[PDB]
């Protein structure tokens, strides 16, 4: 069982990036998949999740429509399309499987409220650095709307 992320690297402020994750060793198409991130020296921050079908895609409040989660079941791939990136988005991004939900809903479809879950398989993470090569003061953030 493994998850391997790709697509991480240096991006300029306002830029876009597409992260990918290759899954192997389990029934990928029947599992929910999540993206989690971790800014350097900071805590784990939940980003997004997607069901088997892609009919349910949920996002953390800071995403504000800038990221789109997607998957290709036959290719065992998970994606995160990211636009309008700022220094607030610099982090390691981890691809994560919800292995526990599989034992309650083996279809991975139903988006039941507050369902039993467990992020049991994690990738090593891919680094996203939103940088212009300036100090912290050269960074941007959100406009505050939406």
């Amino acid at each position: 069982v493994q998850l391997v992320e790709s697509g991480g690297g240096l991006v300029r402020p306002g830029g876009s990036l597409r992260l990918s994750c290759a899954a192997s060793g389990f029934s990928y198409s029947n599992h929910w998949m999540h993206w989690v991130r971790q800014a350097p020296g900071k805590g784990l921050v939940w980003v997004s999740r997607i069901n088997s079908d892609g009919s349910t895609r949920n996002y953390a409040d800071f995403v504000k429509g800038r990221f789109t989660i997607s998957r290709d079941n036959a290719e065992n791939t998970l994606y995160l399309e990211m636009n309008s990136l700022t220094a607030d988005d610099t982090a390691v991004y981890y691809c994560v499987r919800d292995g526990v939900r599989f034992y309650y809903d083996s279809t991975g479809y139903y988006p039941d409220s507050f369902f039993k879950y467990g992020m049991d398989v994690w990738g090593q993470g891919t680094t996203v650095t939103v940088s212009s090569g300036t100090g912290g003061s050269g960074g941007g953030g959100s406009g505050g709307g939406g």
Binding site: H34, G43, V45, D61, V100, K116, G118, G125
Partner: protein
Amino acid sequence: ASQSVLTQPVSVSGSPGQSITISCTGTSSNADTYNLVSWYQQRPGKAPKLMIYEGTKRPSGVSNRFSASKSATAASLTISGLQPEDEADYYCCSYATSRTLVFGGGTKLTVVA
């Protein structure tokens, strides 16, 4: 609208052989928040690892030195017989809303040699 926010102590120190308990307390949370808490261990330079799910269940392969408890007001992780390899950041996680998850801020556990 207010969402569930999980708070943990910033740091805890322990000595080898001792027991430590890390709390995860919520605001805008309820009994279901703690029923659904999962705990993650992140060793220096390693990816996080699931230690507990559904508040108290331990996955196979995870050491029996890790146990967890929950009430209607908090969830706690207990590490018995502290070893240097337990030095890590520990995060609690639960639902922020019916369809989004949130992690606690993390607890840095130092094993004092």
